[PDB]
Write an enzyme that holds these catalytic residues in place. Structure first.
Site, short mmCIF file in Angstrom:
data_model
loop_
_atom_site.label_atom_id
_atom_site.label_comp_id
_atom_site.label_asym_id
_atom_site.label_seq_id
_atom_site.Cartn_x
_atom_site.Cartn_y
_atom_site.Cartn_z
N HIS A 153 38.71 48.74 45.83
CA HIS A 153 40.07 48.84 46.34
C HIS A 153 40.15 48.78 47.87
O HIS A 153 41.20 48.42 48.40
CB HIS A 153 40.68 50.13 45.80
CG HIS A 153 42.14 50.05 45.47
ND1 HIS A 153 43.08 49.57 46.36
CD2 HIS A 153 42.83 50.45 44.38
CE1 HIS A 153 44.28 49.67 45.82
NE2 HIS A 153 44.16 50.19 44.62
N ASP A 374 44.85 29.85 35.41
CA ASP A 374 44.44 28.76 34.54
C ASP A 374 43.23 28.08 35.20
O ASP A 374 43.35 27.45 36.26
CB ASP A 374 45.62 27.78 34.32
CG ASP A 374 45.31 26.66 33.33
OD1 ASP A 374 44.12 26.40 33.09
OD2 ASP A 374 46.27 26.05 32.80
#
Length: 427
Positions: A153, A374
């Protein structure tokens, strides 16, 4: 389910990158010492090279040229402040196979079973021992694939994380980078001297329950149709109210109200809701596009359970709206200065204690391009957090389709969850 690792390798940038130490802002430091988990699922496309890992790793290497701190390690400067050593040691990439199927995950409720689709990280060898990004492509027996992502993070928030993953997938499809990241967190430096305006409510201790018993938590996920959301938004007219609230505000208020009732909170019980908000939208001057790091601030409305219960959803929505509205540039700059004056920033990182009954956290990904990853074989059929850690956290996930539905994933005590589902659908 049995999972078996076929290969694992460190993937480094595919070209030279700056050898630098990257400073972490106060917003980069008030984060978990964990890898934020997310998982993507994909159905076979019919292609013969479905999730060819060579394609994946080559595109990853290119993407790491622009996102090069992702390939670094944590280190501490002389004063002990965590920074990112941009040393290009590389990202972890694991190819895995599973004796189970994508169908085995059913509705994809983000239980802790998803953590098995992300590589494990040993945090006991100090902060420099592990990569900032860990990746797993798992090949299921059914032909489906999951991409599991663990992102440290300090390197980036969800927005930058998504920026990275979607850039990676673009490059896997042969594209060039659309939005070059901007890498310089010093734009979020505190003022000198720090001049906080408020005793920031978001870092104050939340309401408590006076007794505690123990509670296992279950994670469920619930779909709301476009029609249901439209109906919900229209409830802003209840009791002759004429102020309008957004779909986001009305749904988050609805979830908040439903959680309070599902938990059977006493009428007088106070409740705090934690809402992450992206400062990129409000900070002035405008942060450069593609700003790489953490810019998440927290809005924390407060209410009495009995009032949430006995009043229309727009009452909760109004609290949410007001708590978000006050977070303009001055307030965000105040928060940075407030952090600068804290003696220990990891003390402000929120844990299970924060979100236990009576409080709640709601994270919305509804606005975000989470299904744009994708890699050449289609968009995922599901993208979500890789296991909601504890009770009292919820995620709102947009549909992969264009049907305008969304899903509320939430972690609650099991005895609370059934009432929660019933209330959620009383629209």
């Amino acid at each position: 389910m049995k999972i078996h690792v076929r290969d694992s390798t460190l993937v480094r940038p595919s070209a030279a990158t700056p050898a630098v130490s990257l400073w972490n802002s106060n917003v980069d430091l008030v984060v978990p010492n964990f890898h934020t988990p997310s998982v993507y699922f994909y159905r076979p496309s019919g292609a013969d090279n479905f999730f060819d890992t060579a394609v994946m790793k080559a595109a990853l290497g290119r993407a790491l040229v622009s996102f090069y701190p992702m390939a670094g390690r944590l280190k501490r400067d002389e004063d002990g402040r965590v920074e990112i050593d941009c040393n290009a040691e590389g990202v972890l990439f694991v190819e895995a196979e599973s004796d189970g199927t994508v169908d085995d995950y059913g509705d994809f409720a983000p239980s802790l079973e998803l953590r098995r689709l992300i590589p494990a990280v040993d945090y006991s060898q100090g902060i420099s021992a592990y990569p900032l990004l860990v990746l797993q492509v798992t090949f299921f027996k059914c032909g489906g694939v999951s991409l599991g992502v663990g992102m440290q993070h300090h390197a980036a928030d969800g927005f930058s994380g998504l920026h990275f993953i979607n850039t990676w997938s673009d490059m896997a499809r042969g594209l060039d980078i659309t939005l070059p990241p901007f890498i310089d967190r010093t734009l979020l430096s505190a003022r000198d001297p720090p001049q906080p305006q408020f005793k920031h409510v978001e870092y104050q201790p939340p309401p408590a329950m006076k007794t505690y018993e123990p509670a296992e938590t279950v994670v469920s996920i619930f779909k709301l149709t476009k029609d249901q959301l439209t109906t919900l938004k229209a409830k802003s007219k209840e009791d002759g109210n004429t102020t309008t609230y957004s779909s986001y505000e009305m749904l988050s208020g609805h979830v908040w109200r439903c959680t309070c009732l599902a938990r059977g909170l006493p009428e007088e019980q106070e409740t705090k809701l934690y809402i992450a908000t992206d400062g990129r939208s409000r900070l002035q001057p405008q942060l450069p596009p593609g700003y790489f790091g953490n810019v998440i601030f927290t809005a924390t409305p407060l209410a009495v359970a009995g009032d949430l219960g006995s009043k229309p959803v727009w009452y909760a929505a109004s609290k949410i709206h007001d708590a978000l509205a006050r977070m303009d540039n001055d307030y965000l700059r105040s928060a940075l200065d407030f952090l600068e004056l804290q003696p220990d920033l990891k003390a402000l990182v929120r844990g299970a204690h924060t979100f236990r009954c009576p409080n709640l956290g709601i994270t919305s990904w509804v606005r975000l391009p989470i299904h744009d990853a994708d890699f050449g074989w289609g968009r995922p059929i599901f993208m979500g957090p890789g296991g909601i850690a504890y009770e009292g956290l919820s995620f709102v996930l947009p549909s992969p389709t264009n049907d305008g539905s969304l899903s509320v994933a939430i972690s609650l005590q099991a005895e609370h969850m059934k009432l929660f589902e019933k209330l959620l659908y009383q629209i």
